[PDB]
Structure formats: structure tokens, C-alpha cells
Amino acid sequence: YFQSMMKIRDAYTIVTCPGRNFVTLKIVTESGTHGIGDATLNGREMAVAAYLDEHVVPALIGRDAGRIEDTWQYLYRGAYWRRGPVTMTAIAAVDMALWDIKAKAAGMPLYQLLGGKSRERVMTYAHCTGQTIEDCLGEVARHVELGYRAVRVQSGVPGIETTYGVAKTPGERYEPADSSLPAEHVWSTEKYLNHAPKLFAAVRERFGDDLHVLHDVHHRLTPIEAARLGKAVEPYHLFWLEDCVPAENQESLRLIREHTTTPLAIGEVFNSIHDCRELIQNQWIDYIRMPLTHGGGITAMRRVADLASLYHVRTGFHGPTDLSPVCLGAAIHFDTWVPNFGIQEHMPHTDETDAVFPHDYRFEDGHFLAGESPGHGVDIDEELAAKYPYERASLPVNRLEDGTLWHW
Amino acid sequence: YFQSMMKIRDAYTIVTCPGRNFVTLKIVTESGTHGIGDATLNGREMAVAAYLDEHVVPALIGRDAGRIEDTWQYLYRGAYWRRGPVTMTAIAAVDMALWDIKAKAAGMPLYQLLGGKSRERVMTYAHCTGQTIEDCLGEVARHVELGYRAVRVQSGVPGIETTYGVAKTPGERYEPADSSLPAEHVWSTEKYLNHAPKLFAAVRERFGDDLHVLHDVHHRLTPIEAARLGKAVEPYHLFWLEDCVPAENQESLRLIREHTTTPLAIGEVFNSIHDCRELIQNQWIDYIRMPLTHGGGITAMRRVADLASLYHVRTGFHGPTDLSPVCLGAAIHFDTWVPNFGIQEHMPHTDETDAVFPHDYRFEDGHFLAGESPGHGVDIDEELAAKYPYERASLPVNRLEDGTLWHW
Amino acid sequence: YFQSMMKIRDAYTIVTCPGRNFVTLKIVTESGTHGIGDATLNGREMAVAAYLDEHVVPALIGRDAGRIEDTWQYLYRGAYWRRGPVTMTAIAAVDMALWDIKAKAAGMPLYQLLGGKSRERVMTYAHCTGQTIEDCLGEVARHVELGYRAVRVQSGVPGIETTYGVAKTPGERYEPADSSLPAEHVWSTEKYLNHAPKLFAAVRERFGDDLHVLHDVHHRLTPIEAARLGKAVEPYHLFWLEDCVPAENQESLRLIREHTTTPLAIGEVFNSIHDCRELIQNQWIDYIRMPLTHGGGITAMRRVADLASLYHVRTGFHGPTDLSPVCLGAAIHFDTWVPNFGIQEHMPHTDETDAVFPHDYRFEDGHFLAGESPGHGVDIDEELAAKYPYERASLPVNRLEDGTLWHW
Amino acid sequence: YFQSMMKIRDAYTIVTCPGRNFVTLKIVTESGTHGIGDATLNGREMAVAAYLDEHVVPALIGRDAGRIEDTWQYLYRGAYWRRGPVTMTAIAAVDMALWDIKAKAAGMPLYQLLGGKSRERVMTYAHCTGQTIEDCLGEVARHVELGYRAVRVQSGVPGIETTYGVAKTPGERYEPADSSLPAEHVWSTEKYLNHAPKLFAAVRERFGDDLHVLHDVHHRLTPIEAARLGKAVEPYHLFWLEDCVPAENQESLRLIREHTTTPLAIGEVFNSIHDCRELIQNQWIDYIRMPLTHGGGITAMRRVADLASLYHVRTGFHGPTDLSPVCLGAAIHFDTWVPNFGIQEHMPHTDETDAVFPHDYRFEDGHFLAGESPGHGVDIDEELAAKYPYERASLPVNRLEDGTLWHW
Numbered sequence A, B, C, D: 001y002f003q004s005m006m007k008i009r010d011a012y013t014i015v016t017c018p019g020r021n022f023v024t025l026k027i028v029t030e031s032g033t034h035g036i037g038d039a040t041l042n043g044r045e046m047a048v049a050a051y052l053d054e055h056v057v058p059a060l061i062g063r064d065a066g067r068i069e070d071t072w073q074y075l076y077r078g079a080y081w082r083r084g085p086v087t088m089t090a091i092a093a094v095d096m097a098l099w100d101i102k103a104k105a106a107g108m109p110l111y112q113l114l115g116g117k118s119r120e121r122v123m124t125y126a127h128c129t130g131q132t133i134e135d136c137l138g139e140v141a142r143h144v145e146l147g148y149r150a151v152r153v154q155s156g157v158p159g160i161e162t163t164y165g166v167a168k169t170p171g172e173r174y175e176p177a178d179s180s181l182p183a184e185h186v187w188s189t190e191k192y193l194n195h196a197p198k199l200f201a202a203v204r205e206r207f208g209d210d211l212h213v214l215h216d217v218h219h220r221l222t223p224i225e226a227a228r229l230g231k232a233v234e235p236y237h238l239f240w241l242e243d244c245v246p247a248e249n250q251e252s253l254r255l256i257r258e259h260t261t262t263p264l265a266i267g268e269v270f271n272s273i274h275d276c277r278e279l280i281q282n283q284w285i286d287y288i289r290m291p292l293t294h295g296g297g298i299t300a301m302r303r304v305a306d307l308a309s310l311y312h313v314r315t316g317f318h319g320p321t322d323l324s325p326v327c328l329g330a331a332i333h334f335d336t337w338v339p340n341f342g343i344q345e346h347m348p349h350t351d352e353t354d355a356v357f358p359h360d361y362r363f364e365d366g367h368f369l370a371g372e373s374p375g376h377g378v379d380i381d382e383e384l385a386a387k388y389p390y391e392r393a394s395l396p397v398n399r400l401e402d403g404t405l406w407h408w
Ligand SMILES: [Cl-]
Pocket: B083, B084, B085, B086, B087, B088
């Protein structure tokens, strides 16, 4: 009976823009029980939608939803063309939806299914950003009042019009995919390297040593430049220095690790354990940032987290607005169970987004609390979602001062 | 309500000898739901019984049985003294019992909880043993008739009174822990190395190429000797050559791997991922043999299997009579889910043992079929168990012809 | 004037099924000169179509088509999510179209633009397949008569219903994407390993030593199994043994290379130099198989070929029916220039496909001859393409005899 | 027709001394279209002239000038004796001339042929030199006024009569090949190591942090001495520290890289990718300095630049007066296309030299702008060249204070 009940009756995607674009996969079993999974890939959303709609969804009909592992392998190996952002996001969406269903069928919140809670709450960090160091400091003050124990700090660089994590116009909400076609930013590494240490010095001067302070380099340096920055910020004891260098070549982290004791984080642009196996095994990083939606879902990320744990590496899930509350809820469940949890990024969604994706995770005093509802605790209001049609938005590109297409 | 229901009400060990010694841990929740886990460590049984009774059991009372991960870490890290056969067997017993409870609470057979089935049945191998090559061949014929697709072959060595996997007296059941104090066997490596290839040649001559043929070297060689044996048996295409050399020093496998393409298996004497991380990552073995009871249970073995999968290594759980049907049932569930399954060893328990541990796993046509009952599908009949009091039995020791204490 | 003339006026995809699905990108400059690039990703075609239509195409309008390098980096880095089959196929399509335009603007066939011809013709291999070894031998005889100097041989395995490269029904054309949803094949490694050497032995017996003989293992083995096969086929001196093992973990090739001198080829499932940098630098392969359409186009594949050349590795472009004549024409141009050319796969397209994509490359006496028309020498007949609507077709999946989802 | 037109009609060298010696190769096709390439090897000029005149030129007559790759391999492999400064400079001259012809035939400036522009202008550095630190500072001030964003600084060492990059007599133009036979300089490493940091400290004090500051160690240190210097100048954040140690043994860079985060540049004395493959792959340098004339031309340097790009290494072409405007023009084209451009050295030629080699590259506000004329945009006025006969000039040698022949 349970098998017939777990047979997939229907599966389909939902595309909505309640503040920004989200793509969601819904899987409905013969029992009526459904699961949903995040399928949002910022700036390439419709590639994943088509991957799902045309190629994956039709193969899901009639399958046993209880066979999570088999389905993961069927889609991963069966695609023939393996790994990649579009590929692994589609697989993650299916996987997340199937774990949602399994937890509902078991009558348990997801964290219970994974092995139970390892912690009573989930520490987060907030994005503190400003045009000037002082503007950023004001935001740090604000978030400490909200109870955040950890903050990521980003401020504008003098001589540079636009830099990562800083809004074009003060007060306004930072949402990077801000244009139909990519905005074009200009970059100077040398000016940034001379300025960045001043920001952390100021944070420590005003806020002291107890605050966890994070910084995202956002792919812009070469290894020896990142080594230099790491050394320069050692006195400020950062929680992490993130995305120092593009790391398709994983050996790129070696020179940084050999030259600094500033902790390193990487991985939000990764989608496979094969993108980071060497980074982990060689102890070149301290935190792995690959999130559920882009990293092949729960099934794959359990394996990544477990590999990390052998080398003292901790989880630091990417948590921007462009991963939906479906991912965030599942992530908080995962974060609640995983032994080697590090931190959870929190970039709050719009009220409109929260309304479209009702959920039972809570934020209190700087931390997340996992929901107790069976499933990952998130759902989608299809009627409300239909009120916000897709609107194309691309991520910016970054060029050097001479026009060289660089890393954003 | 569910939390109060999952609080541990009672926990205790049961020691029974229905043909041979088994130690079992039972954990009972406030709800009345119980779980059991195998705690049998052959020839050192009472060390684990005491580890549990005096040190672990009292700390379990009042704990939330749903917190599998936290309990595993609490016992593993909290012991202060980490790893080891007594230590990890006690932890495995707790872990297996807690997964049993979790599956019962979820109303699912264990394999469903792990991620669902990856296969429709679980291939096994049988022990085919004989005094002479011909005696062994008779046993191979017999087991093929029973539907086994895979056989482990062991035969006596001329000039050697006693060798591994061969009974002292024909027909009689091989049960290695055959004496109160250790029996003393005599060994000659050179005679074995000259004889062993003749056994495999004979198996191939009589049975052809389709049969999977396994052999256990049982720790007796040095690396270059195992390399020689591996090369000599290449024409017979063994499924694996197992336990070639003692491997506390994991580098011991290197020379074998560099010199032969005969597949290698190791790990029944291991208890930690730290015993085999390097063997796996360096691709020095093809099959990892560490079983649930001795390898820290489901929680730990999922991590071992997942690490193995990155390097094409497959599972080959040790499955002797000295792991109870509790372990075997849990193993069959694990085997049913795990993507990188290789084979399951089958050394059938006595009828008396099967009666003491009722179970829902089935053997059909050379394969195991996972049970469908919630839990791992095994229980223990305490009243029947009480009829078979513990009887001390030790594993043999092996000496060279000059009296040197060697490896059994 | 030339700049205004090279400004992109229009860009769009064309989807057609003249025997099987192809997706093509067309870019039209203000001058009227257009270029086309292959964007076909077998079994996931619409993912690439959407990636292009919704995200890439709109950003191409108004760009200078002459800026090939800048565009490649703009799309590769600017996507933020880097590498992957959908991603790199879209980029390849743009790149191929821009090189087509550049060659037309220069009034030269593509090979001239790349550095001129290094050879007078391009050696190919044909697919020789059969149910039995004898059936395969008949096909070898047939293709030798056509002038092929090199043949890939595949035959059915006894005890196995379906194997790679062998049609379900004799005589009929092998086209793997044969079903709307994936067909399900069954596999036995052990039966294949025992049979495969017999095929090569028979080819050498009937055809002698001068013929180049290739074989595709098609991802089905573990490293030590591939090592065994490599050793077993050494006496038959294969041109290559292809795709021995799945290689997301590039270290997977190490054991094979250490144990056999049979030449190794890999890479048709790769899309990035980062998928194979280590395979090349460690000299673990002899031929790199990644083709233009899937490997990021001319711009990226020049870099891959050049890296290969430092380590004596040669090109062996994947050339199945599911890369369009657009790719094949561009490939023949590339093959004509590249110093370290190895061989070009030839799986002839249908007449209907050849009609839809008129081209000036020629096949004569077992070899390709590059076209002399400016561009890569291929075009698309949009009117004729419109007569063959898309029809969904997926690649098969492969399961072991126990049902384990394996590698097809 | 195009083939007959591209057949080489004539080829010859031109030797001229309009301020210093240059050797140029001219290749004339049947169409009348010609190309030129730089063949200048400072202090050994006539070795290359003879290599070309007697051995290469006669083999060029009748060849198809369009076959750039084939010609490169024909000369590189066909020489039998491979690599080396005389050898690779001759090959570069041919290669540069053939790319000039190809671009003219395509009706495009060279950068368009290479893949189009990656940047709008090419950043340079100037040589700022002085007897004293103050003299050097005056030159820095002067060049900043001219718009240079980057300066190389060299000053005399107290207790040392002569050092690299400093003229014997103030104001006068530095042209190292200053004598018929080698001048003999005296060197003290210890005095230099104690003085050099004072120069950079002074530059930072007077000019601040925005200026890019470079320094050429010019081969004089051992690895641990260079490590010491690198560490000592970290506070001054140099753009690069160049040629720290002689690097025929590429491992020489290891100790420097392990001990300092000052960026490293090397390669002006190299002529082959085989001189620097390991330096690049091990990430021991940040900038590769090998230029077109000495590094086998465009064909070879594209491959070097591409290898560098995999490891974040950028181009920093050697650009002294002893590479002719032919090389500089080709270099600016290359610099305009190459993604991983770092900087272009600018040591301005004499007016007489500029007159002999008319060109369309421009210098504006510290940067080069590529020409737009088909070809590399440089030509040679043979009539004017004939007015300046060759005059032998050798590079200096450097001895330690005890007379030991050292590295200049
Ligand atoms: Cl112990």
C-alpha cells in the first residue's frame, strides 16, 4: 500500500517573482502528499526550468518517490553529461522535494530523519554594508541590536565607483541581480587591497573582539594577492575570508593557505563534491559554502559535509535572497543535525517572498530555530505565486579599469 | 509529546550462547518502543558487555533516543579515549538500537530511512571449504545448487596441519572460536604460496568463468608475498583477495596494489574510518570489509561507504557467525540502500541462533531480501535467550614452524 | 566602418529534428554576414535552448561580434556559475558562430585563421558494430572497403541482452537516444571482461596488424577492472581504449595507467579544461575526446589541445550523430590545423540532416578534407529545418543485474 | 589563386643600427604582400643573422606563407637541435613575419586575428633610474607627469660603482650594450640587500600607494637572499620583484615563493615554454616576462600565455630598446587580445629607430593603443635602414668584489 501511495502522480515547476525570481519544483504522490524543492539559479533561471520541465519531470511520473538515492543516481548518472550548475540545481530540486515527502511520510521534521538535533539553535550572520566604513559600522551596530553574533562587512573602495555587497544608493536593499541585462562594474585590485584592512580595523575599534566578523573577497584576487590580504587582516581575527580567488583550479588556494592563518571559506559557485574534494583533503579551506539548491540537494550535501568533517572543515551554507525559503528551511534542518556546522548566512527575503513560501523556521536573537512540522517545513502558495510573473534579471559583470572582463 | 515518548526509559545488555556467544544491547523508550543493536566482539565479549553495563548504559537513561548523531558524538568524543574494538562495538550497539527505534517511529523499514532501495536484492557469497581441493570443490558444487553466485574458497595446505577456513574434522561446521583458551595453529607461508594457485585453477577448471570466486589470505603474508600471490592468481580472475597483510600501517597495501590487478579487500579488523581513510583515498583497495557491529554502526558506516564511493571502492561487509542476526538484518537494510554495494558475506547462523533472534530478512536464490517491517526487522526473544548461558570461547593463535607468534 | 558592420543585429536559436534533434545558434551582424554554432546537448536539448534564448541571446544584441575572446570571458565568468554541460554548450555555440563570422570577414576558411594547415587530410574512424563478433567483423570488412583505416569495434556480450554500441535489431542504424524516456539496459561487468578480448583477437585474426582498432568501454568499469582489461588486450595493440571509468575524480585513471600500456582515451563527457588538466599533466591519457560543441568551442579547445601537446596527448574529438554537421565542419577545420591531431570520429549523419546543414567538408578514402569556403563552411537551411519539429528523445540508463543504477 | 599568391617569393634579413643594432627578417609573397619579424638578439646579433641567412631563409623560398603552424614546427623540430636563444629568435622572426602577412591577407589588425580586443588600452611601465634615491625619485615624478601609472625603480648602491639600470653618467640614456667588448662591472650582494628597501620606502613616502612600483633584481641573488629581500619589501607592496635568481634550474624559485608574498616576475632570458612550464604549474611566479622576439613568436607565446592563465599568471613582456618596434607593435596587438595581460614594459626607442620602423601603435597617457592597420602595423624603411651600418656592441659582465664572474 505504501508503495502505491508513494508513486509519483504529478510533478511540475512554479516560477514566481515576489521581489526576485524563484523556480520551485513540486512533486505530488498518489497519496496526495507533496514535496517541494528549490530550483532557483540566479540569472539563468529558465535554463533550470527547461531542464526540469522538458527532460526530468516527464521521467518522474510513475516513479516511487521513496527511492531518493536511486532517483539521485538516475538523474546524475543518467543525464550522461554530469555535474554543472543547471544540472545539479535540477537534481537538487528533485532531491529536496523527495526528502520533504519522506519526512512527511515518516511524520517527522527533516532534522529528525537526518539523525536528530546536534544543537539547540543555528547561528547566523547578517550582511552589514555601507558606502563608507562609517556607513558599514552603522549597519553593524544595527544588527548587533537585532541579536546577530556575526556580521559580514563590506564597504565602498575610494577610487572605485562600485564594489561587491554595496548598494548603488544608500539605505536601499542590496539585490545584485538588479538589471535585465548585466550591469557593468569597474574594479581595481590594488585600491581594494590598500583599503580593506582599514574596514576591519575600524570594526574592531568600535565593536571589540567578541563579534564574529566575516568578509567576502568575491573572486577578485590572484592567490599571492589573497595571501597578502590574509596576512594583513590577521590582527583582526576574521571568522573567514571568503572566495579569495576563482577556484576551478583547486590548487589556487595553496599559496593563500601557506602564507596566512586567516580562516578561509569557499564554495558558493560549486555544484559537486568534485569541485572541492581536493580543497578539503589538502586542508586548504576551513568552511565549505556550497548550498543545498546548487549542490545537488540533501543527498549530495550530506556526503560533502561528511568529507569535510574528516579534515575539520565546517559548513557555511551560502544563504542569499536568490535561494528561496524552501532552501533556507531545508538548510536550517540540515544545519540543526550536521555535527560540523559552522554558520548559516542570513540575507532576509522580502515580506512578499515570505508570504509566497509559508514556513515554520523561526529567527530569534541572531539564530534560526528549525521547524517541527513534518517535512522541511516550507510550502508554496501557488495562487499567491501566480500574482508575481517572472521578470528577467541578470547578475552584473566586473571589468578592470582597462576594460578587461574580470570576475564579479 | 514525541520527545517525552522518545526519552530512554531503560537500557540493558543480554548475553546468550545459542551455538556461540552474542551480546545485544536493548534500549526502551517511554513510548514502549524498543530498539536493539549487536554488541558482539568475538573472543572479547565481556569487555564490551562491561563497557556498556558500567559506563554507557547509565548515561543513556533519560536521553532523547531521537538524537542519534548527538549520542554517537557524545559516546565517541566523550569517552576521551577514542576508537578501538571494544569502544566502537559499544558505540555501534547503541547506534544500531537508536536507528532501529527511529525507523519504528517513522513506520518504515530501515532501508527507507536511509534513502530508499538502490537494488532489488542483495548478492551474497558462501563459505566453501574443504580439507583437499576436491573437498572444497564439492562444497562449491553444493552451494551453486543452493543458488549462490559467489563463493569463497579455502582448502588445506599440504605440509600444514591447520589453515584458516578449514574445519579440523570434515563435514563439521567451521566455527573458529572453538576452544575456551586459544587453540594453537602452525603456519608456513612458503607452502601456502606454492599451493593456493592450484585451488583457484581447479575451481575454474570445474566451474568455469561465470562464478564469482573469493579468497581470504587472513593476514598471513608480507606485502611482497601478497604481490606475488596476486600476480599468480590473475589468470583466475578472483572477485577479491582479502586481508593480504596486517594493515595497522595502511601503507602495507602499496606494494601489492602496484604489482597486481587482482582486486583487493580489507577491513574486517578495523573499527574506524581512520583505519582506512588512506587505503581508500590512495586507491589501494577495491572493497571495504568493516561491518556495522564493529565499525561504529550505521552512523559511522554511512560515512565510510560514502568516502569509499569517491574512489570506486565498494562495500563488502564482514558477515561471520559472530555478528548476530541483529547486525545481519541491519546490514541487509544498509546493503539495500547503499549505492556502492559490492557483496554481502553469508555464514549462516545455527537454527538456535535464528530462533533467539527472529527477523524478517529472507534468503532466496543466493541473495538476501530486506525485511519490510519498521525497524531493522530483527528482535530478540529474551526468554529463549536466557536458556543459553554464556560459554567462554577464544579465537585461535597462529605460530610459524619455529614457534614465532604470527597472525591468525 | 568594420566595427559598425560587426555589431550584432540579431541572434536566435533554431531547433530541428531531421533524424534526431539539433539546436543551432545563429548570429547576424549589421553587415548581413552571419555565423552559426552547434548547441546540441543530447537528451537535454531544451536546457541549452532556454539558456541561450532567455539569458545569452538578449545580451548578444549590439555587441561587437569581432570580440571573440571578450565574449567568451563575458559569458563564462559573467554567468557567475561556471562550467557544466548546459553552460559550456551555450558558450560553445556563441564561440563557434563568432569564429564563423571572423573567418568570413577575413575571407578565409577557418583552418587558415587558426594558423594554416598542418596536414593534407584528416584520418577518421568508423563505428563497426554487431550482435556477435562475426557480425562486427562483417562491418569491419565493409568499412575497410570504404577506405577507413581505423575502426571502433563493439559486439554483444553473451548473457547480456543489451550493450553499448550495438543496435537492438541487426542492420538498423544505431542512434542511442532511441526513446522518449530513457530505455533501461542491464549490465554485467564480469561477463563483459571475459568476452571483450575475444573480439579483438578475432579482428586481428581476420584483418591483421595494419588496421587501427579502437574500443569504447563506455564508463562501465572500476579502475582495477580497466587495468585488467588493458593488460588483456595489449597483444592486440588497440589504437585506444576509451572511457574506461567515470572520471569526475581524475585520479581514477592512475591505476589503469600504472598497469597497462594499452593507449587510453577519455573526455567526451567533459566540458572544461578543468575536467582534464590533471589527467593531461600527469600523463594518464593519450587522447582527449572533448569536442567543440560541448567543450566551450574553438576558443577553449585550442587551449585544451595546446596543454595536451606538452605531454604528447593528441586530439580525438567525439564525433557522434548528436553533434551537428556545424560542429563536424568546424572540427575538421580545427583537425586540419592542430599539430597534435590524433583522429576524428565519424558517425555519419542522415541524408536529411546533411540536407538541413549544407557544408563543404568532403569525405574521401577514409579521411575528411577541410572545406575552402570562408567560415567553417557549414550553413543551415532554415526553411528545410522548419519541416522537422523537435521530438523528445532521451539517452538510456544502465542498471546492474541486481537493479543498481549504473553508468551507461 | 590565394595559395599561389601566398607562395614565398623572397626572404631576407636587414641589419641596421639607428641608435643600436636591430636585425629584421622580411618575407615577400608572390602577391607582393610582405611581412616582417624582429630577429634582434642583443650582443649576439650576427649569430641569428647567420642562422637565418644561411640555414632558414633558403628553405622558406617557395613555401606557402599561410602555413604558419607547419612552418613553426618545420623549423623547431626540423632544426634537430631544439630551443635556445639563437634558434628561437630565428623562429620568432619567421613566425612574426608570417602572422603579419596573415593579418594583411585577412584585412585585419593582428589583435583581431587573435580573437579581438580584451581591453581598450595597454598599461605600461617606465624605467625610472638615478644615481641616488633622490635622482630616481626625480625620474618617478617626471614619468608620473607623462601619465605613467607604473614605474620600475633602480638606484645606485653606496659602496658600489655600477649597478643594473643606472647610467654611468647622469641624464644620459641607459643603453646597457654600451661597449664593443663587454664592460666589466663589480657587484656586492650584501650592500645591495641592505640598501634596496630604502629606495622603495622613499618612493612610497614621496608618491603614496596608488603608483605601481616595480623592481628588477637582475639575476644577482641566491634563493634565500631573494626570500629575504622579498620579505623586507612587503610593506611597500611592489607590483613585482623581477629576475630574483638565475632560473635554468626552475626549482630556484621555490624558497622565494615559500617565504614572501611580494609578487614575482621572471623570464626575459627564456626562449621556450620548457624553460617555465614548472615555474607556472607550481605557482612560483606571478608574471611571465618572455617576449615575442625571443620566445618563438606569436605561435609559441599564445601557448605560454594560455598555460600561465590556468595558474593566474599574467603576461609582462620584456620591452627593452633591444627589441625593435616590430616586436613592440606585435606585442601591443598581443597585449590587446590576451585575457591574462599584466603589463607592458616601455623603454622608448630613439627617434632614429622610430623613423626606420614606421608604425601605427600610439602612446597616450601612460598606455599603448594598438594600431588598426592590417598586419602588426609596423614596417621597415630599407633605404633609411641602409644609412645606419651595424656596430658591434656587447652586454656587460658582472664580477664580485673578489673577481668571481657573476650574473649581470
Ligand atoms: Cl578498545
